[PDB]
Structure formats: C-alpha cells, structure tokens
Motif scaffolding. Structure first.
Motif, mmCIF file in Angstrom:
data_model
loop_
_atom_site.group_PDB
_atom_site.id
_atom_site.type_symbol
_atom_site.label_atom_id
_atom_site.label_comp_id
_atom_site.label_asym_id
_atom_site.label_seq_id
_atom_site.Cartn_x
_atom_site.Cartn_y
_atom_site.Cartn_z
ATOM 1 N N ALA A 1 -12.438 36.914 14.317
ATOM 2 C CA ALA A 1 -12.147 37.342 12.932
ATOM 3 C C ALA A 1 -12.565 36.239 11.952
ATOM 4 O O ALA A 1 -12.956 36.567 10.812
ATOM 5 N N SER A 2 -12.479 34.975 12.378
ATOM 6 C CA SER A 2 -12.800 33.784 11.550
ATOM 7 C C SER A 2 -14.212 33.922 10.966
ATOM 8 O O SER A 2 -14.400 33.583 9.775
ATOM 9 N N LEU B 1 -14.392 36.662 8.306
ATOM 10 C CA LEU B 1 -13.726 36.133 7.085
ATOM 11 C C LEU B 1 -14.730 35.279 6.305
ATOM 12 O O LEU B 1 -14.863 35.483 5.085
ATOM 13 N N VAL C 1 -16.143 35.960 2.474
ATOM 14 C CA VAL C 1 -15.780 35.020 1.371
ATOM 15 C C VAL C 1 -17.045 34.616 0.605
ATOM 16 O O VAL C 1 -16.999 34.587 -0.642
ATOM 17 N N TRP D 1 -17.239 35.315 -3.405
ATOM 18 C CA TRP D 1 -17.150 34.111 -4.269
ATOM 19 C C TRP D 1 -18.398 34.038 -5.153
ATOM 20 O O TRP D 1 -18.256 33.877 -6.385
ATOM 21 N N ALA E 1 -18.405 36.700 -7.847
ATOM 22 C CA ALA E 1 -17.473 36.333 -8.938
ATOM 23 C C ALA E 1 -18.147 35.324 -9.876
ATOM 24 O O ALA E 1 -18.078 35.505 -11.103
ATOM 25 N N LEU F 1 -20.893 36.991 -11.801
ATOM 26 C CA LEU F 1 -20.270 37.917 -12.785
ATOM 27 C C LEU F 1 -19.954 37.142 -14.068
ATOM 28 O O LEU F 1 -20.099 37.723 -15.159
ATOM 29 N N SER F 2 -19.538 35.878 -13.933
ATOM 30 C CA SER F 2 -19.187 34.978 -15.061
ATOM 31 C C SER F 2 -20.440 34.693 -15.896
ATOM 32 O O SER F 2 -20.309 34.535 -17.123
ATOM 33 N N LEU G 1 -21.319 37.968 -17.862
ATOM 34 C CA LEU G 1 -20.377 38.100 -19.010
ATOM 35 C C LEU G 1 -20.653 36.989 -20.033
ATOM 36 O O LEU G 1 -20.016 36.999 -21.104
ATOM 37 N N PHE H 1 -17.615 19.572 10.093
ATOM 38 C CA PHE H 1 -17.069 18.973 8.846
ATOM 39 C C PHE H 1 -18.022 17.888 8.329
ATOM 40 O O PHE H 1 -18.025 17.636 7.110
ATOM 41 N N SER H 2 -18.814 17.283 9.219
ATOM 42 C CA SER H 2 -19.947 16.392 8.856
ATOM 43 C C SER H 2 -20.910 17.160 7.948
ATOM 44 O O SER H 2 -21.274 16.631 6.882
ATOM 45 N N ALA I 1 -19.263 18.153 4.520
ATOM 46 C CA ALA I 1 -19.206 16.945 3.664
ATOM 47 C C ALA I 1 -20.575 16.707 3.016
ATOM 48 O O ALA I 1 -20.632 16.593 1.778
ATOM 49 N N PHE J 1 -21.392 17.239 -1.066
ATOM 50 C CA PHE J 1 -22.016 16.077 -1.751
ATOM 51 C C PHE J 1 -23.330 16.528 -2.400
ATOM 52 O O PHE J 1 -23.560 16.268 -3.595
ATOM 53 N N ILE K 1 -22.879 18.649 -5.508
ATOM 54 C CA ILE K 1 -22.314 17.783 -6.584
ATOM 55 C C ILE K 1 -23.464 17.006 -7.231
ATOM 56 O O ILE K 1 -23.557 17.026 -8.474
#
Ligand SMILES: CCCCCCCC/C=C\CCCCCCCC(=O)O
Ligand SMILES: CCCCCCCC/C=C\CCCCCCCC(=O)O
Ligand SMILES: CCCCCCCC/C=C\CCCCCCCC(=O)O
Ligand SMILES: CCCCCCCC/C=C\CCCCCCCC(=O)O
Ligand SMILES: CCCCCCCC/C=C\CCCCCCCC(=O)O
Ligand SMILES: CCCCCCCC/C=C\CCCCCCCC(=O)O
Ligand SMILES: CCCCCCCC/C=C\CCCCCCCC(=O)O
Ligand SMILES: CCCCCCCC/C=C\CCCCCCCC(=O)O
Ligand SMILES: CCCCCCCC/C=C\CCCCCCCC(=O)O
Ligand SMILES: CCCCCCCC/C=C\CCCCCCCC(=O)O
Ligand SMILES: CCCCCCCC/C=C\CCCCCCCC(=O)O
Ligand SMILES: CCCCCCCC/C=C\CCCCCCCC(=O)O
Ligand SMILES: CCCCCCCC/C=C\CCCCCCCC(=O)O
Ligand SMILES: CCCCCCCC/C=C\CCCCCCCC(=O)O
Ligand SMILES: CCCCCCCC/C=C\CCCCCCCC(=O)O
Ligand SMILES: CCCCCCCC/C=C\CCCCCCCC(=O)O
Ligand SMILES: CCCCCCCCCCCCCCCCCCCC
Ligand SMILES: CCCCCCCCCCCCCCCCCCCC
Ligand SMILES: CCCCCCCCCCCCCCCCCCCC
Ligand SMILES: CCCCCCCCCCCCCCCCCCCC
Ligand SMILES: CCCCCCCCCCCCCCCCCCCC
Ligand SMILES: CCCCCCCCCCCCCCCCCCCC
Ligand SMILES: CCCCCCCCCCCCCCCCCCCC
Ligand SMILES: CCCCCCCCCCCCCCCCCCCC
Ligand SMILES: CCCCCCCCCCCCCCCCCCCC
Ligand SMILES: CCCCCCCCCCCCCCCCCCCC
Ligand SMILES: CCCCCCCCCCCCCCCCCCCC
Ligand SMILES: CCCCCCCCCCCCCCCCCCCC
Ligand SMILES: CCCCCCCCCCCCCCCCCCCC
Ligand SMILES: CCCCCCCCCCCCCCCCCCCC
Ligand SMILES: CCCCCCCCCCCCCCCCCCCC
Ligand SMILES: CCCCCCCCCCCCCCCCCCCC
Lengths: 223, 220, 223
Positions: free
Chosen positions: A32-33, A36, A40, A44, A47, A50-51, A54, A101-102, A105, A109, A112
C-alpha cells in the motif's frame, strides 16, 4: 493560456491519482506504501499548479515571473519519486532506508538550490544552480550504481524493470535543469510561454507516466 | 482580553503536558510514543498561542497565522494518536497513519491559503480542505475502525468513543472558519477568538485525557 | 572580513564531509546511517554559511540578523542529537521514541532562538528562556535515561558515549551564552566578536564531534 494550461494539468493529476487509487484496491502484491506515494505525487503537484492557474503561485522578481509554486511542488513530489524508484530496486528484498534517505536529502537540497538560484542574480545564481547540478549527478551515480546493484540482488526480472524506470526518470530529470538554464530563470534564450509548456508536459510524464510504468511493472511480477 | 485569553490557554496547555508526563512515569502498558505525542500537541499549541498573547502570531482583516503553525503539527499528531489507538494490541498500519497525516497537513495548508485569498479563490481552497476532512472521516469510521474491531470489543468500544469525540471537534473548526471573519463574516471576531480558545482545550488536552485513560484501563 | 570568514568555514565543512565519506568506504562495524548523518551536518551548515558569505543569509532589523544560522541549526543540531542517541544505542536495541523526543526539544529550541532574535525587550528573553528550558531537558535526558542506555551496552561503549556527551554538552552551553552576550541579546560583545565565535564553535560541533564520535565507535570494531 498559461492559466488554462495549469487548470488542465491539475485535472490530469486528479485523474492520475484516481487511477492509482483504483489500482490500490486490487494491489497484486505491491504494498500500500507504493500506491500512497504514487497518489501523493500527482495530488500535491495538482494543488501547486492550481495555485498558478488561480494566479497565486507566482510573483514578479528581477523583472521576471518566478513560479515559486513549482519549487513547493518539487520539494515534496521529487523526493517521493526517488523513494518510489528506491523501493522498486528493493522490491522482494531487504530495504536500505539509509540509501533511500540519502537520495531524499540530495533531492530536497537540489530543489532548494533551484529556488535560491531563481531569487539570485549574476554569478550567485550559477553558484546555486551548479550545487544543484552536482546533487543531481550524485543522485544519477547512486541510481545506476549502488541502487541498481540492490535491484540486481533481487533477481533478473526485477532488475530488468528497475533499469527501465531508472532510465525513464533519469531522462526526465536532466530535462528540468536544462529547461531552467535556457529559460527566463537562467540565460533567457527560451521564451516564457515555451518554458511554461515544457514544465506542463514533462511533469505529466514524471508525476503520472513514471508511476503507471513503475506500478504495472511491479504488478506483472505477481501469480 | 484577547491577549489574556491566550496567556490562560498556554498555561492550561502547560498543565496538560505536565499531567501526561506524570502519567508516562507509570505507563500501564501504553507505549512511551503515545505519551510523547500527547505531550508535544499541547506544548506546541501552547507556544503558538503564546505568540498571539505577545501580539506576534498575527498580521492585520486580522490573520492569526500562529493557529496554522499550531494545527500543521498538532492536528496530524492527534490523527496519529487516534490511529495508534485503533492499532493498540495489534499490528501497526503506518501507511494508513501517514495517509491521514498527509490529508491533514494538506487540509491545514488549504486553510492558510484560503485565509490569504479573496472571493471565489478563498472558497476553492476551503472546499479542497473540506474534501480532505471528509476523506479523513471516511477512513476514521471505515478502514481505521475495522482495525480497531480486529483488536477486540473493549479496544473497539474505546476507539469508537475517542473517534466520535475528535470527529465532533473536527467539524466545528471549518464551520467556525466559514462563519467568522476569514469567511462569510457573519460571526464577530471576539466570538471566533473564544471558539478557537475553548475548542482547542477539548482537542489538545481533553482528547488525550480520554484517549490515555481508556488505553491505561485495558492494562486491567 | 565577515564574508571571507564564512567562505573559509564552508570550505572546511566540505573537507570534513569528504573525510566522513572516505571513512564510510571502510566503515569498521559502524552502520551507514551514522556516516550519512556525519556527512549531512557539515554539508547543510556549509551551504547555509555560503549564503551568508554571498550576503543572502542575513538582513537588517538597525541590527543584523544572520537568519541562515537558524536554517542551519534547525537541521544540523537535531542530526547531532540523533548521532549522540545512536552512539548510546550502539550494539543494542534502539529507542526511537527517546531519539525523536530529543529532536522535538532541539527543533523547538532553535525556533525560540529565531523568534527571540526577531523580538525586542521582555518578549525576546521569554523566547530565549523557553529555548534554555528545552536545552536543560535535553541535558537531563543526555546524562540521565540516554546515558543509562549507553551503560546497558557495555563499559567501553558507555565510556565513549560519556566523552562525546560531555564534548557536545560543553559546545551546547556556548551557543546561548554567545547569543545572550552578542548583538541578538545584551550587546556586550561586538558584531565581529560574535561572528568569529559562531565560525569557530561550529567547526568543533559540525566536524569535531563526528571525528571523535566515529573514531570512538570504529575503535570498538573486532578485526
Ligand atoms: C521539507 C521537505 C521534506 C520532504 C520529505 C518528504 C518525502 C519523503 C519520503 C520518504 C518515504 C519513505 C517511506 C519508506 C517506505 C517503507 C515501506 O514501504 O515499508
Ligand atoms: C499546496 C500548494 C500551495 C500553493 C501556494 C499558494 C500561495 C498563494 C499566495 C497568495 C497569493 C495571493 O492571493 O495574492
Ligand atoms: C537536506 C536535509 C534533509 C535531511 C533528511 C535526511 C537526513 C538523514 C538522516 C537519517 C538517515 C535515516 C536512515 C534510516 C536507517 C534505517 C536502517 C536502514 O534500513 O538502513
Ligand atoms: C552521471 C551519469 C551516471 C553515472 C553512473 C555511474 C555508475 C556508478 C557505479 O557503477 O558505481
Ligand atoms: C525540443 C525543444 C522544444 C523547444 C524548442 C523551441 C524553443 C522556443 C523558444 O526559444 O522560446
Ligand atoms: C500519461 C502520460 C504518460 C504515459 C506513460 C506510459 C503509458 C502507459 C504504459 C503502461 C505500461 O507500460 O504498462
Ligand atoms: C514555537 C511556535 C511559535 C511560532 C510563532 C512565532 C511567531 C513569531 C513572529 C514574530 C514577528 C514579530 O515580532 O512581529
Ligand atoms: C509536518 C509534520 C507532521 C508531524 C506529525 C507526524 C507524526 C506521526 C508519528 C507516527 C509515529 C508512529 C509510530 C509509533 C509507534 O510505533 O509506537
Ligand atoms: C508525506 C507522506 C507521503 C507518503 C510517505 C510514505 C510513508 C509510508 C510508510 C510505510 C510504512 C510501512 C510499514 C507499515 O505499513 O506498517
Ligand atoms: C461528514 C460526513 C462524512 C462521512 C462520515 C463517514 C462516512 C462513512 C465511513 C465509512 C463507512 C465504512 O466504510 O464502513
Ligand atoms: C455560550 C454563550 C453564547 C454567546 C453568544 C454566541 C454568539 C455567536 C454569534 C457571534
Ligand atoms: C541552504 C540554505 C539556503 C540559504 C537561503 C538563501 C537566502 C535566499 C536569497 C535571499 C536574497 O537573494 O536576498
Ligand atoms: C516531532 C514530533 C515527535 C513525535 C513523534 C512520535 C514518535 C515516534 C517514534 C516511533 C518509535 C518506534 C519504537 C521505538 O523504538 O520506540
Ligand atoms: C516541530 C516539532 C516541535 C515539537 C514540540 C516542541 C516541544 C516538544 C517537547 C516534547 C518532548 C518532551 C519529552 C520529555 C520526556 C522524555 C522522557 O519521557 O524521557
Ligand atoms: C529556568 C531558567 C530559564 C531562564 C534562563 C535564562 C534567563 C536569562 C535572561 C535574562 C536577560 C535579561 C536582560 C534584560 O532584560 O536586559
Ligand atoms: C541548569 C543546568 C542543568 C543541567 C544538567 C542536569 C544534569 C542531570 C543529571 C542526570 C539526571 C537525569 C536522570 O538521572 O534522570
Ligand atoms: C497531498 C495530498 C495527500 C493525499 C493523500 C492521499 C490519500 C488517499 C486515501 C488513501 C487510501 C487508504 C484507504 C485504505 C482502505
Ligand atoms: C558573486 C561573487 C562570488 C565570488 C565567490 C564565489 C565562490 C564560490 C565557491 C563555491
Ligand atoms: C551536494 C554536494 C556533495 C559534496 C560531496 C559529498 C561527499 C562525496 C559524496 C559522493 C557520493 C557517491 C556515492 C556513490 C558511490 C559509487
Ligand atoms: C552499467 C553502468 C551504468 C552507467 C549508466 C549511464 C548513466 C545514464 C545516463 C543518464 C541520462 C539519461
Ligand atoms: C481519573 C481522572 C483524572 C483526571 C485528571 C485531570 C488532569 C488535568 C490537567 C490539566 C488540564 C487543564
Ligand atoms: C459568496 C459566498 C460563497 C460561500 C461558499 C461556501 C461553500 C464552500 C463549500 C462548503 C462545503 C460543504
Ligand atoms: C460528528 C461527525 C460524525 C461523522 C460520522 C458519522 C457516520 C459514521 C458511519 C459509521 C458506519 C457504521
Ligand atoms: C461550542 C464551543 C464554545 C462556544 C463559545 C461561544 C462564546 C461566544 C461569546 C460571544 C461574546 C460576544 C462577542
Ligand atoms: C466563528 C464563530 C462561529 C460560532 C461557532 C460555530 C460553530 C462551532 C462549534 C461551536
Ligand atoms: C552512499 C553515500 C551517499 C552520500 C550522500 C550524502 C548526502 C548529503 C545530503 C546533502 C545535504 C546538503
Ligand atoms: C528565503 C530563503 C528560504 C530558503 C529555504 C531554506 C529551507 C527551509 C528552512 C529549513 C527547513
Ligand atoms: C523543522 C525541521 C525538521 C528537522 C528534521 C531533521 C532530521 C532529523 C531526524 C533524524 C532521524 C534519524 C534517526 C534514524 C534512526 C536510524 C536507525
Ligand atoms: C518504526 C517506525 C518509525 C516511525 C518514524 C517516525 C516519524 C517521524 C516524524 C516526522
Ligand atoms: C520546552 C518546555 C517544556 C516544559 C515541560 C514539559 C513537560 C515536562 C517534561 C519533563 C522532562 C523530563 C525528562 C527527564 C526524566 C528524568
Ligand atoms: C574583536 C575580535 C575578537 C574575537 C574573539 C574571538 C574569540 C573566539 C573564541 C572561541 C570560543
Ligand atoms: C576541530 C576539532 C577536532 C577534534 C578531534 C580530536 C582528535 C581525534 C580524537 C580521537
């Protein structure tokens, strides 16, 4: 036109999310993970876009339009895409959450540095851009190096699928920083409207296309 | 008055947190994780509401942005607490739990964006937040309740109680938001302020008192 | 000078990160997770301090707020605490509840610091005080329940944990001391003085700690 395009995008994201939900109801051995994560990503992105539709997810800076909603999108959607790819490699074997998670990360970064670069002017912009590209190269090295070796450790059939989706995503990855540099955020060779269409069409293949190929390939491994 | 009310709120949150800590010292079969969640909720809310009391957590209509900073952390933690209650004594479903966290975090964000918006745009964001809430409720009384039932009559009875408690409070927030200055502007600012002082005391402290006591009683 | 100092710092972080990466290639019984943490801390801090060097990670509020410091610490300091917690748990069962307890306290701590820096008069010192209370609770956990976990994992591990716990605790108290004495607080210390303190301290925390931490754990390796 820019507004209409973003409305259309958001609707396609919604359709994509619904398709992944329906798939999740008959999961065929896929946890299921992974459904999901697949849901998402488009929701996401939908959304965030959509911003823009608008007229909220952008502002005027350095006399150019900064679509900051794209960075709000990517900072969540792109690490989730990498998680999806990493879990595909690890399918039917022990997980390596350290490596996963490497990638998360490095990716966060990366996005950003993109945002900071877009807010920056002159040499400073290309220092941040460069750091983002270095992060992307390291992600690619991991993708075709240690992460692919994890895929191979999980058998011929799984490895064949991983390699396919790895190439799919990697091809799309390199397009984004290329378009960014060519467009108004960078050298300004490409027109604003051209960039807008690129960052509407690419994401349809990444936010929906990737998960269709990814999930179908894993589902096919089921007896 | 608005300042004093928020000071009082923050003190009640502190007292609530201290009570949950004391409970955590004699845990009665409840994992430390559920005590940590119970403590973070009030402490975080307390800090956010203290920012309002000091006249920092708002900009001037008047937007109390400190409420969204609060909820974006406190509300997903409440859902985690509810999910772990359903899963008490059985296998955990962290996928479902994080599904609820994702829906909830999105919900609070739509609220913030809606508050910064004007006209049709405000109610598009509000509506998306409501749709998130409906899906949370469907999960709460659907698949999550089924997990509760799978963990025995006594646990299911307790889960159902705290599920109804929290669900009742959930629907109040978007209702007050729509009626208040952020929405239709039918309700006076002072009325809204009191609602978002009293409701949170029942959600941030009340819920965990009922939740933890019910789980502790399962030790006997 | 302030700009040049930050450039130098960022380079030292880069060197530190590379050293931890090389160590990770010959891990000597230390899990990959602890090498990942050791690498992220200096790289993130390096990037944050680079933003100050380029004159982006600060603004005027009359007085100068180095907000990039808080962007750094909100990620770097919780990771340091995670490193310390995993050291205590080395060779034994993990207590992720306690670990995330420390992360929560620490993140709150850094936020109070930022809000305090944006505040004036009594309000500033209310936020500062809440941050100090968080730090006291972190210290109590560090030398209390977390040390007891260390003791449960043998003489040699506990001896090492105690040493790195004292190392980090010494540095912890320096930050709020320098903050209070500097422009953000009482304003007894000159801006240049504070800048040098928040360049030198972080070299011992962002690189020093992980050198001592990793070496101590690597020494425990048999063969
Ligand atoms: C600020 C930006 C932070 C964005 C981070 C969010 C994206 C992270 C996703 C990690 C997902 C890893 C989940 C592992 C699944 C394990 C399993 O399937 O058993
Ligand atoms: C979830 C994605 C969120 C998108 C960010 C939207 C921010 C809108 C800012 C307000 C703009 C305006 O109304 O003038
Ligand atoms: C740019 C900031 C983003 C930082 C977020 C990620 C930092 C990495 C921190 C911890 C690594 C977690 C590894 C989990 C270990 C589980 C064991 C395993 O399966 O490998
Ligand atoms: C950048 C392009 C991708 C480079 C791939 C290198 C593979 C690394 C490896 O085999 O370990
Ligand atoms: C394939 C690339 C598609 C875009 C090429 C045309 C660029 C137009 C422009 O300069 O704006
Ligand atoms: C929708 C946008 C992208 C399409 C992606 C690929 C099309 C589906 C192929 C499914 C499969 O490979 O089994
Ligand atoms: C901890 C939770 C606190 C969050 C809210 C803090 C708000 C601080 C805003 C200060 C701005 C000002 O002084 O005008
Ligand atoms: C955005 C920030 C959101 C923060 C809230 C999320 C926290 C969820 C915590 C889930 C913990 C479940 C594990 C508990 C256990 O195994 O005992
Ligand atoms: C933001 C969150 C987006 C979705 C992220 C994925 C987290 C899923 C966690 C997987 C846990 C697997 C173990 C279990 O199901 O109990
Ligand atoms: C507010 C109204 C929204 C819906 C409340 C809950 C809907 C029913 C829950 C699912 C029932 C089930 O699956 O058994
Ligand atoms: C309890 C007392 C109710 C006080 C009156 C409520 C006013 C709501 C409309 C503004
Ligand atoms: C990694 C951390 C990044 C530091 C943030 C950079 C500051 C934003 C740019 C501000 C400006 O250009 O004025
Ligand atoms: C930020 C808010 C922190 C609250 C989060 C919840 C704690 C989750 C930790 C899960 C613990 C797993 C089992 C254990 O090792 O204790
Ligand atoms: C963003 C996340 C912010 C988290 C909330 C800020 C304050 C948190 C504090 C809760 C942690 C206190 C735990 C102390 C008890 C630990 C123990 O039982 O040993
Ligand atoms: C319990 C400990 C919490 C308080 C800790 C530190 C207090 C320091 C603040 C004093 C500064 C006041 C200076 C001033 O107002 O001019
Ligand atoms: C004010 C300074 C306080 C800092 C140090 C506290 C030292 C705590 C010593 C161990 C107590 C923890 C325990 O055993 O539970
Ligand atoms: C950012 C938006 C996040 C939305 C998450 C999507 C959740 C959809 C519902 C999950 C399905 C669970 C049902 C199990 C039965
Ligand atoms: C703009 C001027 C910047 C000059 C220094 C660049 C240093 C980059 C290091 C990475
Ligand atoms: C984002 C900037 C990174 C700076 C350098 C970090 C240290 C080196 C990392 C190398 C990772 C390579 C992993 C694949 C090996 C095969
Ligand atoms: C077997 C060695 C792996 C090298 C793969 C090459 C890198 C892929 C290029 C990505 C861009 C598309
Ligand atoms: C047996 C019931 C015990 C209830 C104790 C209530 C404690 C409340 C703490 C402060 C809340 C405000
Ligand atoms: C002009 C006023 C329109 C208000 C719209 C409110 C409806 C939002 C959706 C409610 C969901 C039940
Ligand atoms: C206070 C709001 C309550 C919403 C849930 C009501 C419907 C629950 C259906 C459960 C089916 C058994
Ligand atoms: C139900 C939650 C509590 C409701 C409190 C309502 C108080 C309204 C007081 C209005 C005074 C005049 C502005
Ligand atoms: C904004 C205040 C409106 C009054 C309260 C609306 C209903 C919420 C539950 C009491
Ligand atoms: C296999 C080793 C992976 C090294 C990646 C290091 C992660 C650094 C994250 C960037 C933060 C700045
Ligand atoms: C205005 C500069 C914003 C930079 C974003 C830094 C990352 C977010 C804060 C830390 C998490
Ligand atoms: C507001 C910014 C949020 C801070 C989060 C930074 C990440 C720190 C969390 C550390 C978790 C690593 C521990 C994993 C256990 C290894 C087994
Ligand atoms: C064993 C399950 C681990 C739960 C991870 C904790 C969630 C981090 C909160 C952000
Ligand atoms: C950040 C402000 C926290 C206020 C107090 C929170 C509730 C009490 C926490 C006590 C922690 C003690 C842990 C060590 C046990 C020995
Ligand atoms: C005016 C310059 C004074 C600089 C003093 C720096 C002190 C550093 C000590 C680190 C601890
Ligand atoms: C920058 C400070 C570094 C301290 C390291 C100490 C030497 C290693 C001890 C083992």
């Amino acid at each position: 036109m820019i507004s209409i395009l973003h409305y259309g995008y958001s609707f396609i994201m919604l359709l994509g999310a619904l398709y992944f939900y329906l798939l999740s109801k008959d999961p065929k051995g896929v946890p299921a993970s992974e459904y999901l994560i697949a849901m998402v990503i488009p929701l996401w992105s939908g959304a965030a876009y959509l911003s823009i539709a608008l007229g909220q997810g952008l502002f005027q800076y350095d006399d150019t339009t900064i679509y900051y909603a794209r960075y709000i999108d990517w900072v969540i959607s792109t690490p989730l895409l990498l998680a999806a790819l990493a879990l595909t490699a690890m399918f039917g074997g022990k997980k390596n959450l350290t490596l996963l998670f490497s990638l998360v990360a490095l990716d966060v970064f990366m996005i950003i540095t993109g945002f900071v670069a877009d807010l920056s002017i002159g040499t400073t912009k290309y220092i941040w851009y460069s750091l983002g590209v270095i992060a992307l190269i390291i992600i690619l090295v991991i993708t075709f190096g240690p992460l692919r070796r994890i895929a191979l450790s999980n058998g011929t059939r799984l490895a064949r699928h991983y390699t396919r989706v790895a190439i799919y995503l990697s091809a799309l990855w390199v397009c984004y920083p290329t378009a960014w540099l060519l467009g108004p955020s960078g050298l300004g060779l490409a027109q604003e409207l051209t960039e807008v269409l690129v960052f509407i069409i690419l994401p349809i293949f990444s936010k929906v296309g990737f998960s269709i190929v990814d999930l179908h390939g894993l589902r096919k491994l089921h007896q």
